[PDB]
Design a protein around this ligand. Sequence first.
Ligand SMILES: */C=C\C(=O)N1C[C@@H](n2cc(-c3cccnc3)nn2)[C@H](OCc2ccc(C(F)(F)F)cc2)C1
Length: 208
Amino acid sequence: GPHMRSIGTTKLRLVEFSAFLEQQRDPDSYNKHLFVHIGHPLLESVDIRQIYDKFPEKKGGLKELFGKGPQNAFFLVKFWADLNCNIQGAFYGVTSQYESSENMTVTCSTKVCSFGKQVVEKVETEYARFENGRFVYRINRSPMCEYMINFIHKLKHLPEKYMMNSVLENFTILLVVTNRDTQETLLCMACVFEVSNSGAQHHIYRLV
Ligand SMILES: */C=C\C(=O)N1C[C@@H](n2cc(-c3cccnc3)nn2)[C@H](OCc2ccc(C(F)(F)F)cc2)C1
């Protein structure tokens, strides 16, 4: 029973995101493979109660966060990942760009969850840069955690995409972007994953 509606006004917008493997063939030659990406306006809704068991739910958990921060800042992102790359000076990285009309100090928290339990959290703090009339927050070449590198390797070893999808049923990512000074939730993305059989795809929903 979803509702499909505009996003409306938000203090922070996600403009770009990619997760990638860059491999250096030699000092002047590099290959880059994208696993997932966004950015390269009606949204349907998803009942957040459907996903509580896939994320931590203690103090500071998804249910507490949703109850507090503005509800229009919460999204579910379904990714279809591209695993079709020949892994061989490899750098596993993420890039993202956010934009705002306000100058803020932003903290981005990325929690990796397995069977609904947090197994890694990455925390990055970003200051604004003024760029042609607005404030831009760019994360360039943020390294993956060891857990994701190992996880990608293990998935790639499986012989069929449906076996990777079964494994991915219990893997999720929770991104929470907060105003560091005020603790306001600026954006929250609860992320679920399958493997693409198409490159990579995604669909975004509003959490309600
Ligand atoms: C320590 C964490 C880490 O290295 N990660 C977090 C994963 N992540 C980040 C985001 C995200 C979404 C929107 C905005 N900002 C960040 N979503 N997921 C990164 O890995 C992504 C990923 C790569 C490959 C696969 C796989 F295995 F299915 F192919 C899944 C997820 C890195």
